[PDB]
């Protein structure tokens, strides 16, 4: 049974809420995919998760407790304020915004208007639809924000509509990277 | 758990046999960098980032070194409970709207990976490609499995087939995930 | 220079 593989995982997490004014530190010791031990800056100590971590529990606490508790400050708080502020929490990527009509046009005929908002960062954004400068609220839907994996996100928002003479629909995008909203029109 | 931001500063993954290891830094789900254990070098996904912050690979090495250690004290303590293969799930989507002739990137997302060992490749017209293709490290999941993305730059064509070949032990046959413009 | 969480050893 050589095809009998193995693996352990060490997964640290620094949860930041409102700057560093509030941090929760979590350390997960994993075997294959079972979590057997863990540290929680909220529980205040190491605790055995499964039966497997029953051994380590006492040894990890007696030894590394004070050292692990401190990481909330030496790793978490420190990194956030020293490395994150000038990189992550400063990256602002304006999105591209296009509008494509779902089916072929046809006056007075049920159709959709898709607004593609791609390549932006961070994720928090807001896309609106307007019809003759009057906001369309009914028949507006969207996809699940997509994490492209290359430090950018994308999303598509639909507007079921009915193309009529002289109508000008508008996609409205507001983002932390925009001094003012990006507005794209679609003319009937 | 909830918060405005999350940072995994030092995710270690030691896999035996093969002494296969990964060491990464993750922030809000994206990948900052990984320590190339062979070159003893810190590989940043974003260039402009390494010009404002840095990390010493030795830290990677030291912790990987501990992964090796612990993955043994455990592999034994668990009476050797081998790990359980899973079946990965691929999903192919564009990066931006596919305009004909207009450059673009094909993104293949693969979730539910376990263990983190896998071959992802592209195929243009059932024929394979190996170029202009790049992939991310193994991102962790809440259920302790992983996911990874592979990228294939290309030019939108009204006569081009594409596939995301995904090979993994927990997959009898290499799964393919079609896509067309 | 950023730091990292120490993957403690066992036994």
């Amino acid at each position, epitope marked *: 049974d050589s095809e009998r593989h193995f693996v352990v995982q060490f997964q640290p997490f620094c949860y930041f809420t409102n700057g560093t004014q509030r941090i929760r530190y979590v350390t997960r010791y994993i075997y294959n995919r079972e979590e057997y031990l863990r540290f929680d800056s909220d529980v205040g100590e190491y605790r055995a998760v499964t039966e497997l971590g029953r051994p380590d529990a006492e040894y990890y606490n007696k030894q590394y407790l004070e050292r692990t508790r401190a990481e909330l400050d030496t790793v978490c708080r*420190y990194n956030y304020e020293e490395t994150e502020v000038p990189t992550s929490l400063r990256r602002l990527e304006q999105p591209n915004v296009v509008i494509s009509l779902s089916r072929t046009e046809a006056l007075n005929h049920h159709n959709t208007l898709v607004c593609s908002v791609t390549d932006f960062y961070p994720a928090k954004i807001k896309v609106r639809w307007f019809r003759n400068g009057q906001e369309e609220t009914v028949g507006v839907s969207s996809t699940q924000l997509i994490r492209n994996g290359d430090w950018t996100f994308q999303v598509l928002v639909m507007l079921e509509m009915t193309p009529r003479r002289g109508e000008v629909y508008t996609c409205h995008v507001e983002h932390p990277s925009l001094k003012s909203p990006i507005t794209v029109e679609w003319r009937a | 758990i909830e918060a405005d931001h999350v940072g995994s500063y030092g995710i270690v993954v030691y896999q035996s046999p093969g002494d296969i290891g990964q060491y990464t830094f993750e922030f809000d789900g994206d990948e900052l960098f990984y320590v190339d254990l062979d070159k003893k070098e810190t590989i940043w996904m974003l260039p402009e980032f390494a010009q404002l912050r840095s990390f010493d690979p030795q*830290g990677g090495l030291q912790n990987i070194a501990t992964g090796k250690h612990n993955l043994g004290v455990l592999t034994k303590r668990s009476n050797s409970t081998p790990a359980t293969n899973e079946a990965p799930q691929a999903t192919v989507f564009p990066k931006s709207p596919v305009l004909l002739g207009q450059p673009n990137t094909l993104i293949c997302f693969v979730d539910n990976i376990f263990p983190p060992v896998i071959n992802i490749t592209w195929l243009r017209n059932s024929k394979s490609v190996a170029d202009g293709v790049y992939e991310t490290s193994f991102f962790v999941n809440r259920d302790y499995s992983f996911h990874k993305l592979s990228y294939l730059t290309f030019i939108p064509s009204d006569d081009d087939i594409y596939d995301c070949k995904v090979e993994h032990w927990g997959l009898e046959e290499p799964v393919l995930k079609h896509w067309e413009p | 220079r950023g730091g990292a969480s120490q993957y403690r050893p066992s036994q």
Partner: T-cell receptor
Amino acid sequence: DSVTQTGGQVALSEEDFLTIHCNYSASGYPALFWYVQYPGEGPQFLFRASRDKEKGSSRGFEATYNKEATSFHLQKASVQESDSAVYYCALSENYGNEKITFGAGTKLQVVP
Amino acid sequence: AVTQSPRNKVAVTGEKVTLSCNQTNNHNNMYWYRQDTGHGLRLIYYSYGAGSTEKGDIPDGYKASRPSQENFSLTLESATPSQTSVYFCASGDASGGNTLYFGAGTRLSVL
């Protein structure tokens, strides 16, 4: 990184008050310690301190992590003739390196 | 504990010298320091485990090997007078700022 510490040699009488200065110059958030090198032996751990304001102690010796003045000054009640040894101040970064940097050391001579 | 060998080495310029260190602490970390006046301890080499050779702060003129767990050796290819000093070996469990355990040293002089 560097750990700069009090001169080279100091001399005290028994019962005197010990104070050995140590300032450090680090890039991250380092752990600080003190080791002792008794005559004819190798250095040895005394106590550590992982974060600002934390105090470390051992065998009557103590030092408080002061991030503000980047100091980790060693202090003791009243020294004893057997305290004569070389005191090393040191640090380790928060990078996981496991690299322990040291200072020049300070020779302490407690007169009988 | 930790033990070194030899505990006194008189050597000649050019000669190839080697120091040996053993430990029953079972730590995965082992280091090679040298003590000089005005310099204190300075790290030359250390290892994260068997097969590990990490260059410390003052590597030049040195080489090392961690053939197993309990043994880490340092080698001066072409010994020189500037390499005259007391060498101390140490082991650590690799637990963030791992406290270090030192051997009694090896007094070496290059005439």
